[PDB]
Design a protein around this ligand. Structure first.
Ligand SMILES: [Zn+2]
Ligand SMILES: [Zn+2]
Lengths: 869, 862
C-alpha cells in the first residue's frame, strides 16, 4: 500500500476489510442449520475487528445474505454479540458502531486506545493462549492476566503441604516401573497432576489436541505430571491397548507436540522446555495388557505458549496473526517533547478558542494571502460552511505536506472545518477541476491526518474526516452528491470534544514542519521562556552578583527582559532604576521597545553617569572592550556602594547579573572582566535552547569542534563547563522540528536566485516578510547582495504587487526583510535565516555557530565560489 | 475484639471463621440431591474468603461431613473451584492454600495485596452489581471494569446512526397513546431498548427480580426504554391482562423498586435517578384487552447500583457486606518515602543474609540479656537447632515495639527468621505459671504479621508461629509449606518489611536503624549540597533549627578535598566551642581549630575555610571575617602569580540560636550574599521537630533585639513541615513541671534504668542543665538516685564532661558546653521559666535526636 486501495462504491478514508457474505439477524442466526458456516463467519468478523482495533481503526463491509433484512427490525446476532463482549470486556459501544447502507452492513471500529484509568493494554487479543493452572483446571489467561504473567516473569528474569503431598504421590507413581490392572490411584488432580479427558479410543488425536494446554499450564506454573491411561470416574489404571498404538509412536508424537510449542524468553540462557516421558506397563496376572504414559514438566524460566496467541494486526492489506515474539513485544512495549503535552491546553486556548462567535479562518497570514490572491474564496467557503455558526476553519497550502507526506501542485489549498455537532470536513480546492487525482489526494490526506491525530496527537475518541472536493471555477457550489455516511457518534458532540481534537491538532502541528508549526512553535517558546524565567528568578533572592554562562542558542535577551520585570516586582523599584547594558545598538532598540526599564549600550554607559540606577543587567558581556574604561568597576560601584560613615543606616546591595556566552567571542582584546577564577558565584543555563533540532545539531557540532581545538582568546576553564550530554538533554527537551540546509560552490546570481525562489515559496505558504533575515558575513558585500536580490526577486515576481524593500538590522520589529551583516544582527533572531558567506576553510567554519544562533526554525547557509584573480 | 478470640483447639495467630459443616469432594459434591444446601455452602465459603482477603487474611475452618474423606484421594469440589477462580481471576494458588487436619478442612487465605504489575484493585469483590449495557445485553461489571467506570465518572464530575434510529423508534412508541392487539413492533432491542423475558403470568415478581439490572444498565450507559408486554419471539404487543394486575399497582411497585436502588454521587447536586413510567392501553376491535408498561430512564450523572455490591469485609468477628458508599470509598481510595527508598540498603547493612552461623541481634540488648541471664545463650542455641542460616532479633517487648501493650511477665521476645523455616516468635517468661503467656504470644504474632503486611508492604505468605519458653525449665500449629520462607530473596523481603515496620515505631532497634537512616540521608544531602562547590566560592548557609550543620560540614570538607585535589591539611574548620573542635578533629582528617586558635595563629598553607557556629563568634579579639577573606581571597602581587586562585569560604549560620548579644563581626545582612537556606537537614523525632517549630513561631512573632527581620524572613513554616514530614522519624518528647531536685533525680534514674533494660547503652544518654553552677548539685542528686535504683549495683556510675561525647559514659554538662553535639536521649534540667525564657526549648531540642525529657525545677523560696 503506497497510499490506500481504490473503492469507488465506499470511498472511505479508513482501511476497509471485506468479510464476504454473512447471515445477520437473531432469528436467522438461530435458525442456521450449518454450524461450520456460523463459526467461520463469526471468526472472520472477530478477526477483522481485532485487526482493525490493533491497526488504527477501519470499516468492515459485509454483504447481507437476506434481501429482506433490516437492522432496526431484526438485529445483529447473539453469537456475534458474545464474541464482541469476549473481545472487548470494557464495552463494545466505545469501539464498534453498526450501520446498514444498501445491502451491506458496515461495522465501524475505533482504534484501541488504552483507557487512562484502565491497565495499559497496548493491543487487543481474543485469547492469550498462555495457560496457567489453577486447582484442577487450566485457564486460558485473558489479556490482562497475560500482561500480569509477562511482567512478573520479566521482573524475575531481570532481577536474576497437600499440594506437595499430591506432588509426592505423583512422583512415587512416576518412579514405579510396572502397574496392575484396576490398580486404584491414591491421588486426585491438583496443581501438579492432571489425568482427565486423556483416555480415548484413539489416543493420538486427543493427545495432539489437548496436551499443549496442560504443558503450557504446567510450565507457566510450577511443576506438573500428565497421566494417560487412567479412567476418569473410578481413578483406576485402565491403560491403553498395546495393539492400538505402540509406545514409541506415542513418545515421538509427544516430543513433536512439545517441540512445536511457541516460547518467548526473557533470560539470556534461553533453555528449551524440558520434559521426561516414561512409559509404564500394566500386567493382569503377569501377561501384558497395555501401557500408561506419564509426562513430567518442570517449571520453566519464561512463558510457554500453547499455540500462537490469536491476536491479529493488519499487514499488506491483510489480516495477519501475531506470533508470540511479536505479541510480547507489542504488549510489553519493549518521542515528541513532553512539554508539548504539558502546554497543548494553553496553546489551544490561545490560538484555537472554542467560542460561540462566527466561524474563524486560521491562520491569519495564509488566509490573507489566499483571499487576496483569490477573491471568491471567502464567499465560496462561507457558502459551503453554512449552516454553521460555531467552528474553526484551518487553512493550509498542503495539509498532506503539513503531516509529512507529498505536496501536490494542483491543490490550491486545503481547509479543515472543525465544528460542534458536525463532522470534521477536509476541503481540497483544485486549480483545474479536471485533474484526475483529486479524490485520491483528498482520501489519502484525510486518512493520514486522522492517523496522525490518533498516533501523535493522542486523540482517544471517534472522529470522521470527510473528504470533500471543491473548485473555484465552479459557479455553483456542492455539485453532485456526497454519499459518505458515518454514525452520529463520529461527529463532535460537545465543546470539550472540540477542545480535545484541537489539542491533538496542536501536538500534530508542533511535531511537523509547516507555517502553522512555526507560529505555534513561537507561542510554545514564549511559554517555555516564561517557565525558565520563573525558575531563574529564584536566584534573585539568593544572589546579588551572578555570572550566567550560556550555551549557544540560549536566547539570553528574553530571559534578561523577564528577569528585569521580576526584579521590578521583587524589589519594588521604579522601572527606570533598572539598567540593561549591551554592546550593539540594534539590541538596544529591541530591548527598549520590549521593556520599560532603561536600556543603554556600553559606550553610553561609560560616557554617562547613572546616579539613580539600583540594579544592572548586562548582556553580550563577552564582546565588551576595556579601551574606553573599565566598566566592571563602574557597575560594581553603582551596585555595591562603599559605606560613607554613618550616613547610610542600611546600605543596599543591588543586582549585578552578567550574561556570558564564552563560545561567541568576536573581540580578541581583553574583555575587562575579572579573571575566570574570580567569576563567582556562577550559573550555567542550558534549558534556554529554543530552535530546531537541525540548528541545535549544527551548533553542537561547532561546539565540539571548538572544544577540540580551542582558539587563543578562549580559555580551557570556561570551555570545561559545557558538556555535550547536557546539550542533548536540553535539545531533546525543548527543540522542535525544523530545516537546516547548506549549499556550496555557488555564484552570486545562483545565491540570489536560490534566496528569491525560497522566499517566494515561503510567502506562498503564508510566511510574512518579517520572518526572513538575510545575513552576510562580510559587511562590504551588502550592496552587491542587495543588487543581486533585487534583480532575482524582480525576475521571480512577474505579477509584482508591491516593491521589494529590505530593511537594516535596526528595523527588526518592522515588516520587511532584513539584509545586514551578522555583526549588526547580534542578539536578534528571526524564523528564517539566509547565511551568505564566502568559501570557508576548516579554520573559518566556526561562524556556523554565529549564523545558527540567529535562526529559530530555518537556516539556509549558502557559500560563494572562490574568487578568480 | 480487644486483641483476639480464644480458640483452644486451633490457636492460630490469624482470625478464624467457622463455616460449619460442609460436604467436600468431587464425587460427594456432584451427587448432592439438595441444590439449596450446595449453593448455601458455596456462598458461605466464598463470602468468608472475600472477607479474609479484604481484612488482612486468615483461616477458614470447615467440618467435613464424611468421616471417610481424604483430601488427597477425593479432592475439593468443582463448584467451589469455579467460585474460587471467579473471585480471583489472577490465580487462586497465590492466595488460597488447603489443608486437612483431623475432621476439619482448613483454607488459608492470604491478604489481597494488589500486585505491583496489577491494576490497583484495592479490594476483591464477587460482583460489582454495577451494570453497563452492551447492545442487547446487560452485563454485571467485573471489579476492574467497575474501577474503570468509577474513575471515568469521577474525572467527568471533577472536570465539570442505527442506534439513534432504535432510540427514535422507541421514542415514537413511547409517544403513542394507544396500541392494537398483535401490533408488530418495527424495532428490536438495542442499547436503548430491552423487552426480553419481561412478560410472565405474574408480572410483579419478575419485575421485582429483573428491573434493577436494566435500570442500572440504562442509568450507567446513555438512556434507555424498558417495554413490558411484548412477546419475545414474534415482537407483537401481547399485553398484560387487566384482571391480573392494575396499572397503578405496577407503577407503584416500579417506583418502589427504583427508589430502593443504591447510588453513589461524585457531584455536589446529588440528583435522584429520574424516570418516566407511562401506561399504554391495547384494544382489539375497540374493546379493552390489557395494557403495556414502558419505563424511560435518562442518562444519570453518577453510578447507580442494581443492589449492594457483594463484597465482604470483617467487622466485629463477623462477615459483613459492603454498602455502596463503603465499597466505592474503599475501591477508589478517596510514613516517609525515603524509608521505602533506603530499606534495601538498611537491611543489607544491618540484617545481611549469609550462610554463616545464626546471628543474634541487636548486639546491645543481646549483651544485656546474656549477661543478666547466662543460660539464655545455650537455651536459644538448643531451640534454634537444626538451623545454620538465619537471624534472631531480640526485643524486650515486640508487642511494645509494634505499638501495643508491654507485659512485665515477659522477659524478652526472640524472632527467628531463616530460610526453609517458618518465622518463629519465642516469648520467654520469668514465671512459667503465668496464665496469660499463650494469649500474649498469639496476639503478638498476629499484630506483628498485620504490621508487616500493612506498614511494611510485605506481599507474600508468612507464618509467625507463637512458641512459649521458660528459662527455669530444665506444638500443634501446622501451616502449609508455602508459608515458610523459600529463598534468600524472600528472607530479604521480609527483613526489609521489618526494617520499615521498626522505623515506623518507637524502640531501641527503631533508634539504631534511625541513626543509620539519618546517615544515609546526610550522605544524600551532602552530595546534593556539594554541587555548590563548583558554582560558589563564598557562601552564607542559613540553617533551620535541627539541620545538623556539623555532619554536612564534614562531608563538604571531604568533597572539597576530592574536587580540588588538595591535601587534607589545606582545609580548615573554624568553630567556637572546644568540644565541637575535638569532635570534628576525630571525625575528619582536615585541620580543625577554634576561633581563638584561628585568630591567634597564622595560617599560610590554608586554601579553603569552612566555618560553623558562626553566629556565636565575637569580634572583640579582632575581625575574623577579614582574616578568612585574606586567606581565601588573596590579592594579586604583580606578575608572581600566573593564575591566582580563590578559595572556599563557607559560613554556616543559625539565626535562631544566637547566644552572643555582641556584634558577630559578619558583614551586614545586606552584604551576606550569595546565600543558601538548607531545609532538608532535619534529623530528629516528629515531637522534637514540633517543639522546635512552636519555638520558631514564638520567636518570629516576637523577634528579640539581636536578630533582624530580614534574617527571620527566610524561614517559613511550610518548608519546615515539608522537611519534618519528609525526613523525621517517630520518637518521644515529654515535659514535667514543678518538680523538686530529688524528684528530678529519681525521674532521671528511673528512666535511665528503664532504657538500659531495653538495650540502650550509656553513650546514648546526655543529661544537660541550663545553669552551669547547678552541675554539682545535679551530679550528687543523680548519683544518689542511681545508687538507690540500682540495688544490684554491677558497676560504678560514671558521668563524663561534654568533652567525652565519643566515650561510653553519660554526659552531665551545661548546654553551652554541649554546643554542636547530639545524643539519642537528652534530659533537660532547668529552673522554672516564664514566657520570655521559654526560647531555650529550642536549644535543648537541637541536642536530642529521638528522646527529649524536659524537666523544670520548683521555684526557689526565699
Ligand atoms: Zn527463559
Ligand atoms: Zn451525580
Amino acid at each position: 500500500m503506497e497510499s490506500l486501495k481504490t473503492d469507488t462504491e465506499m470511498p472511505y478514508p479508513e482501511v476497509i476489510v471485506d468479510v464476504g457474505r454473512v447471515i445477520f439477524g437473531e432469528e436467522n442466526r438461530k435458525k442456521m442449520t450449518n454450524s461450520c458456516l456460523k463459526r467461520s463467519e463469526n471468526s472472520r468478523i472477530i478477526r477483522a475487528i481485532c485487526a482493525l482495533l490493533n491497526s488504527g481503526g477501519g470499516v468492515i463491509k459485509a454483504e447481507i445474505d437476506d434481501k429482506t433484512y433490516s437492522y432496526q427490525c431484526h438485529g445483529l446476532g447473539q453469537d456475534l454479540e458474545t464474541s464482541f463482549q469476549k473481545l472487548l470486556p470494557s464495552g463494545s459501544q466505545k469501539y464498534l458502531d453498526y450501520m446498514q447502507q444498501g445491502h451491506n452492513l458496515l461495522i465501524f471500529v475505533k482504534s484501541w486506545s488504552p483507557d487512562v484509568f484502565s491497565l495499559p493494554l497496548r493491543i487487543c487479543s481474543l485469547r492469550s493462549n498462555l495457560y496457567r493452572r489453577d486447582v484442577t483446571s487450566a485457564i486460558n489467561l485473558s489479556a490482562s492476566s497475560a500482561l500480569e504473567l509477562l511482567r512478573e516473569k520479566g521482573f524475575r528474569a531481570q532481577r536474576g503441604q497437600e499440594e506437595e503431598d499430591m506432588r509426592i504421590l505423583a512422583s512415587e507413581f512416576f518412579k514405579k516401573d510396572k502397574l496392575m490392572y484396576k490398580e486404584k490411584l491414591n491421588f486426585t488432580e491438583s496443581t501438579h497432576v492432571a489425568f482427565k479427558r486423556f483416555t480415548t479410543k484413539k489416543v493420538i488425536p486427543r493427545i495432539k489436541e489437548m496436551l499443549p494446554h496442560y504443558v503450557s499450564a504446567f510450565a507457566n506454573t510450577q511443576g506438573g505430571y500428565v497421566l494417560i491411561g487412567v479412567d476418569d470416574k473410578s481413578k483406576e489404571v485402565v491403560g491403553c491397548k498395546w495393539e492400538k498404538v505402540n509406545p514409541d509412536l506415542l513418545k515421538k508424537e509427544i516430543e513433536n507436540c512439545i517441540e512445536k510449542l511457541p516460547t518467548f524468553h526473557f533470560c539470556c540462557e534461553k533453555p528449551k522446555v524440558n520434559f521426561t516421558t516414561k512409559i509404564l506397563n500394566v500386567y493382569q496376572k503377569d501377561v501384558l495388557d497395555g501401557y500408561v504414559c506419564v509426562i513430567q514438566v518442570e517449571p520453566f524460566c519464561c512463558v510457554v505458549f500453547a499455540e500462537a496467541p490469536d491476536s491479529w494486526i493488519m499487514k499488506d492489506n491483510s489480516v495477519t496473526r501475531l506470533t508470540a515474539e511479536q505479541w510480547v513485544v507489542m504488549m510489553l512495549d519493549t518521542g515528541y517533547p513532553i512539554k508539548v503535552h504539558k502546554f497543548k491546553e494553553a496553546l489551544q486556548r490561545h490560538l484555537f478558542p472554542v467560542t460561540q462567535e462566527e466561524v474563524q479562518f486560521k491562520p491569519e497570514s495564509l488566509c490573507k494571502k489566499l483571499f487576496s490572491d483569490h477573491k471568491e474564496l471567502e464567499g465560496l467557503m462561507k457558502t459551503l460552511i453554512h449552516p454553521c455558526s460555531q467552528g474553526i476553519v484551518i487553512f493550509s497550502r498542503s495539509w498532506a505536506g503539513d503531516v509529512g507526506f507529498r505536496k501536490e501542485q494542483n491543490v490550491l489549498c486545503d481547509a479543515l472545518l472543525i465544528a460542534v455537532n458536525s463532522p470534521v470536513v477536509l476541503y481540497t480546492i483544485l486549480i483545474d477541476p479536471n485533474w484526475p487525482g483529486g479524490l485520491e489526494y483528498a482520501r489519502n490526506t484525510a486518512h493520514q491526518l486522522k492517523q496522525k491525530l490518533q498516533t501523535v496527537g493522542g486523540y482517544t475518541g471517534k472522529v470522521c474526516i470527510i473528504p470533500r472536493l471543491i473548485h473555484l471555477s465552479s459557479t455553483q457550489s456542492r455539485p453532485g452528491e456526497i454519499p459518505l455516511r458515518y454514525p452520529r457518534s463520529y461527529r463532535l458532540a460537545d465543546e470539550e470534544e472540540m477542545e480535545d481534537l484541537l489539542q491533538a491538532l496542536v501536538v500534530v502541528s508542533l511535531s511537523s514542519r509547516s507555517l502553522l508549526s512555526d507560529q505555534m512553535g513561537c507561542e510554545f517558546f514564549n511559554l517555555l521562556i516564561m517557565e525558565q524565567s520563573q525558575l531563574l528568578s529564584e536566584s534573585l533572592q539568593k544572589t546579588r552578583e551572578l555570572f550566567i554562562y550560556c550555551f549557544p542558542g540560549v536566547r539570553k535577551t528574553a530571559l534578561a527582559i523577564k528577569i528585569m520585570e521580576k526584579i521590578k516586582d521583587l524589589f519594588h523599584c521604579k522601572p527606570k532604576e533598572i539598567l540593561y547594558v549591551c554592546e550593539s545598538d540594534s539590541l538596544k532598540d529591541f530591548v527598549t521597545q520590549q521593556t520599560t526599564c532603561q536600556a543603554v549600550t556600553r559606550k553610553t554607559f561609560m560616557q554617562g553617569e547613572f546616579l539613580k540606577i539600583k540594579h544592572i543587567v548586562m548582556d553580550e558581556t563577552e564582546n565588551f572592550c576595556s579601551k574606553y574604561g573599565n566598566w566592571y568597576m563602574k557597575a560594581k560601584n553603582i551596585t555595591h556602594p562603599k559605606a560613607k560613615g554613618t550616613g547610610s543606616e542600611n546600605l543596599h546591595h543591588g543586582i549585578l547579573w552578567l550574561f556570558l556566552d564564552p563560545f561567541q567571542i568576536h573581540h580578541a582584546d581583553v574583555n575587562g572582566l575579572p579573571p575566570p577564577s574570580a567569576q563567582f558565584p556562577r550559573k550555567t543555563i542550558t534549558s534556554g535552547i529554543h530552535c530546531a533540532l537541525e540548528i541545535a545539531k549544527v551548533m553542537k557540532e561547532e561546539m565540539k569542534r571548538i572544544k577540540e581545538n580551542p582558539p587563543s582568546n578562549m580559555s580551557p576553564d570556561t570551555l570545561a563547563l559545557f558538556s555535550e550530554t547536557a546539550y542533548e538533554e536540553a535539545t531533546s527537551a525543548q527543540a522542535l522540528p525544523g530545516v537546516c540546509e547548506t549549499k556550496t560552490n555557488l555564484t552570486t546570481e545562483q545565491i540570489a536566485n536560490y534566496v528569491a525562489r525560497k522566499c517566494h515559496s515561503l510567502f506562498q505558504s503564508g510566511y510574512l516578510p518579517k520572518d526572513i533575515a538575510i545575513l552576510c558575513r562580510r559587511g562590504e558585500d551588502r550592496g552587491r547582495y542587495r543588487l543581486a536580490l533585487l534583480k532575482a526577486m524582480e525576475l521571480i515576481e512577474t505579477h509584482r504587487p508591491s516593491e521589494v524593500v529590505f530593511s537594516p538590522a535596526t528595523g527588526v520589529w518592522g515588516s520587511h526583510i532584513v539584509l545586514d551583516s551578522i555583526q549588526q544582527f547580534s542578539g536578534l533572531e528571526r524564523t528564517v535565516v539566509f547565511g551568505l558567506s564566502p568559501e570557508c576553510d576548516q579554520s573559518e567554519e566556526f561562524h556556523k555557530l554565529c549564523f545558527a544562533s540567529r535562526a529559530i526554525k530555518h537556516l539556509y547557509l549558502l557559500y560563494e565560489k572562490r574568487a578568480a584573480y
